[PDB]
Symmetry: D4
């Protein structure tokens, strides 16, 4: 069926991180698309992607980028849809540049930001799912089952 | 009308920041409740608030805290609703402690984090609006008007 | 005999760090328990653990967590017992997120925080021992012997 | 009555912060002494203070310092009593130098570290109280009352 | 005369900083335009400004922004002209977010970044002048005079 | 033909980073020279290099250094030419010392600073090319072709 | 008497900090000179000052600067005298840029670095005194008196 | 002959760094001693070492430590001799805790601080040599020869 979440990232090297978002949406049976869109090298591609997202039926955009990470913020500038941002870990500054470049958006143009790295990618997918679950009772039930299994699966003591 | 967004904050001192979220929801005519809930000083109040949020009809929770800011994360631990986190600027570390203790959530329990301070409070309310707009056409139109006015009102040159 | 110290951690991956606390309590013949309790994935488990700790005869809780590290702080919210916090080293931010998330507790709910990593785990055990030694003369004598041996064992010059 | 807690600080300028520890111990009626002891300017005063603390009847030492804050760590070097460290906010680096120079102790000589500033001073006194409460039933009851009042006094909504 | 340098900034609040660039270009008699252009609130205004800059006769663009400062980078995405970036000091993080989000550009789309604040604004105008001076002899002479006066005017001893 | 760009660096160990600047100038057929000049070990060599650069026909200087990185700044003190600075990644502080040592120049003596590491070296070359392209139509055409190919070469989706 | 210590600083604004070095040398009756020398705006003045320091009879140089603080390091490049560096507190980054750009010198050209701000200025003068005291018995006695008075004058308890 | 420089460090693991100081003193034929002295585990050893250093004929102390690095500062508290501090690189925080713990000494008790790691150890030795060279003409000549060879040995271009 048509995608309701869009996962976008600046480059192939981002995929090692963003694949965890993709996996989780697939696990929760959320139809989505996964694309490369680079804010600095393909800025017109980004403009077109973001401003047509709503009319294309997307409900949430998950965007990942590292370094001077402008992809989530510029996506949000062109869409009214909620945009979730994943800071990709950078080589020198370990994602601190990614984090600050994404989370520190000015008032008026939001990006809901998740943790640096794979955890943030997973949680962007989960946050997107909790948003969609507000209107989709079947997904809401799957998400509840997922959260309940997570809780039940935590062991009671460590292995030495 | 029954609140569909809950704004919670750790203390009265957070209100200077979180009032910007409250004002924005009011401007967009989003029914909401605005409460003090402290993860450390009132942990049972928090548990009850978060675990009953969904059955009370809340759709999104906005949570603001500073320092070792645990309020958004522990709220997300007890609800399947989307939780948006606002790092409140702390005295010594200028909200960097607030930011890291909110954004760096483990995979499995997300918090959509906004900028440190008033800007983040305003954006949490806007992000909450964009989530609700997915399934409220009248609100989607008002949000569209809000973003259009923001864009159109930016001056073309500085005043000296 | 019944445990007087509880060592808790969010996950198996924390054990590589927290095992040093366990080893030291065993060395000093301090009866203890070692458990996994995750603040975000098992928040009700945490609530029950912390609020029954005193009646179960625990005297000190040592809690380790990394990233948005909320386990020590939320433990302290539910118990009047002293809670000692160990920041576990995180991948991207090297435990700085862990450290700030733990040490920056608001006035009214304390967590005595130790160094990032294995050193902090060892010192949490030693700090717990110095607390217990205030009422336990045999342990006080063992601790004094331990500190004295540490001092006597420092070499006078390096090996080239 | 003879002091069971010693509060020491590097200088008069630290008092603005450490007075919060003094006030809390007084509120809980914990006999204590409040002194200036500087690791760098009065190192022999420090050596004598710390090495005689236990035989003088002290149970816990609370030590506050800023900058290259060596007072808590060197105090712990000379006593087997639990030492709690308060990072005082420094002018330039806002207590980040204070924090790192206190919390990052080597394994073998612990300092239980609290938050930067007044909050950390208050919490050091509370942590000291929770330690003493383990073997003083009357004090344990007063601490229970203190925490219960803290929890109950948190307002339910912000004042505008 | 037609502008050969464009100074753009995200908002009126940036003017306190960017006015130093404007004053310097005026002092050196470099024809320029000074405009407000916001990457997030006016992204289409930015796209148009940057993509037409060269055909409008601009030679250098100076762009100032704070927080998640995306203005210089997105400007460079759409022009082949040299873009110089001025990190504006932000309230919470003192321009460290501004700095990292401007300087850490991916290979392929450069931004020549100057210091945080007024100094960086002044230097962006001076750097723009040194670029134009390469092919404007009269301006090169005025810049030489400017640097010579700067050097010669430094006092030999402090005034008390 | 005679060099119009000078690439300088403090040591052989900088070459692993600065070679990317060299490669890009060669790709764009920009005549250049590549030298070692160390601000601290050969300060008179630096003084002579920088103050004769313009008369030798250089148009732009690209300077790379790490740690207490003073080579770009001191180069700029002695020339009126535009100086572009590349922070070389340092072992302990990952180039943060390099970055701050270079970008934070006082008003009056500019250094256009690029990203930490290989990306910054590549972009210094590209920034130098965009400066030269202002007066050199053939190079301007090559640069435009280069930017256009960069944009066209970005893939549309990632490889799993 | 001829100066044996040179105090140099980048600008008049540094004097608020460096006056503490000047006052201390005067108190200890160490003949000195106090001058403005800026690495970036007056690089030839710096070269001449540093290379002639030893033949002019100077024994120690104290150098203060903020931001990209290159003054101490470039001074050490041109003299074999010990150079002591004072990081002056900068507006945005609170002297962290000053600190890193001074302390992180390459092996081969040392700068003995003191604390950010007035404390570092005072300590640079004291460190210079302790160096001169090695071969001036009268000064060694005055320094001994100074340190003894410092130690003895520390109060025993805070004033409320 | 009797040692005139003392190199001290907290542990064997510091030797990997401090060996570079030792090597350089030996190269310059400066008689020295090299010892382990740990501020926290052997505080009385430190007190005795530092307060007898001058009467034992030492002229300069070089002290290295990592983490909460108190060895240089506490050494300086007990001696009037110049004390040079080397921040040893720490595992989690890469020596930033070491650096701040050492350099941020309060006014009145100086530590001349060098770079994090091997470079700082080498430069502590060189700084110690420049201090001793003020009174020792033969060493002064060796140091000048050493500095001159360093300068002459810098290559003119990199190897590809
Ligand atoms: Cl804003
Ligand atoms: Cl508080
Ligand atoms: Cl300036
Ligand atoms: Cl001070």
């Amino acid at each position: 069926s048509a995608p309701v979440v869009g996962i976008i990232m600046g480059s192939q090297s981002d995929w090692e991180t963003m694949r965890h978002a993709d996996a989780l949406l697939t696990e929760l049976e959320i139809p989505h698309e996964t694309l490369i869109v680079c804010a600095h090298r393909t800025p017109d591609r980004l403009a077109d992607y973001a401003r047509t997202a709503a009319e294309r039926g997307l409900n949430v955009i998950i965007a990942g980028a590292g370094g001077a990470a402008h992809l989530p913020g510029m996506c949000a500038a062109w869409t009214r849809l909620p945009v979730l941002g994943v800071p990709v870990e950078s080589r020198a500054l370990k994602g601190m540049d990614s984090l600050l470049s994404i989370v520190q958006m000015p008032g008026g143009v939001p990006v809901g930001t998740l943790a640096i790295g794979a955890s943030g990618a997973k949680n962007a997918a989960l946050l997107a799912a909790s948003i969609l679950a507000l209107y989709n009772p079947a997904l809401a039930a799957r998400l509840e089952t997922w959260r309940a299994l997570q809780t039940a699966s935590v062991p009671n003591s460590p292995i030495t």
